[PDB]
Amino acid sequence: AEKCGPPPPIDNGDITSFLLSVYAPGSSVEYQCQNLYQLEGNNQITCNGQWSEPPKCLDPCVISQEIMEKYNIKLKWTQKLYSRTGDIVEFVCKSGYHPTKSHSFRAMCQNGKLVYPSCEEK
Amino acid sequence: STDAERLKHLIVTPSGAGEQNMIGMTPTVIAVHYLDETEQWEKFGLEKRQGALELIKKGYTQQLAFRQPSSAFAAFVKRAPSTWLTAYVVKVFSLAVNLIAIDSQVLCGAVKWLILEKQKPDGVFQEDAPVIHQEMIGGLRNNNEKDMALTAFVLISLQEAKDICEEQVNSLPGSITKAGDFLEANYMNLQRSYTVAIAGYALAQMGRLKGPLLNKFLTTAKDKNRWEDPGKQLYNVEATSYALLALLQLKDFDFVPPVVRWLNEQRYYGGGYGSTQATFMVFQALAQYQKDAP
Amino acid sequence: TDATIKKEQKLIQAQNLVREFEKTHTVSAHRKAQKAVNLVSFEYKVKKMVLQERIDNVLKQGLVR
Where is this cross-link: Isoglutamyl cysteine thioester (Cys-Gln) (chain B)? Predict the structure, then answer.
């Protein structure tokens, strides 16, 4: 009723306290995302019976060696592998393979996507 | 069932820092666990059970002195928190909830820490502060396939504390799923029988050790009774115990008798330098065999 | 209110298993009662201490088989 129910469960994250069975009116709850996950919204959503809009964990990017070796590319600073939402990743070609100009070798990480440039041999 | 006359030495007094104390709890906790689930207390001496329970109490409250405010655990309070030590403490305490009283918030705070802080985007769990005693971590000391084996270890500890931390941690199912996704993705590329066994147990708990992945697990066994790699035999005993627990989850009881026969024929009764993971897993697997015996 | 429903189902299952332990001083009822009491929420703090005191009292009396 005038109090509150359970806090809304977000993806790739959770609240920062012990989950109460019944929540008081007007109480706000802090949210936290997993590692490298970028939060987008108010971490403290307040409590009528309907909760405030919970924040969203923006996904990060995983640059695995498999995708790079299939594209014949390396990193400029070869190896963090993990990148946050917005971190620019600078790729380079491998020995013998030259750039194909398919994409600029400076790739941004938006949510989950990240476009990989390619390199080809003579 | 292994005669309890040999296991008298596993009753010890937990004494040490954030790591030695768990090396002290491990034999006492797993011995009481074994004798309870095998129903050998009457012949071994039931009067000793209460005293052994008091020893487990000591280790529990002593370990609480090393619980960092981040709900994590390390050898000292001002030291960096270890992912493996937190997962192991969760595992030992999750078995100990059947023996002594345990605060649920301690285990669940440690689980929330492992999920939010020490799980990478692809579901891998990362050890950012390795323990001082690399002999208490068993076959996981080997560097090859450290990602797969550590993720499986933390995943097994999370699924053990599932009963206690389901209500308070909503990120637990998603974290378990992400870890199993990583294991399933890189399972067929494994070459180390220890990793095949521990990841097989983790996936079998999730009901994912099926199809070709399942085939790899069963075909890794030499002579269809043991999971071994070139190295110390304590690692091979730990791996075969993980494999026995995976088999017991898979209900493949036509494969179990040779494995239990090999485990009994090793005559391993616990103890030895860095015998923590070996003693814990061998007696966990044997106890779960006697409980799930066909 | 499935949250509070389970919060109370844990309590009643702990009550029945602690009573079964008090009536049957065995290892099996000890493990079941201890696991059930530990799973009770932080809400019923004093009630958990009562049931844990009862488990300890039964253990002081002793158990058989």
Answer: 17-20
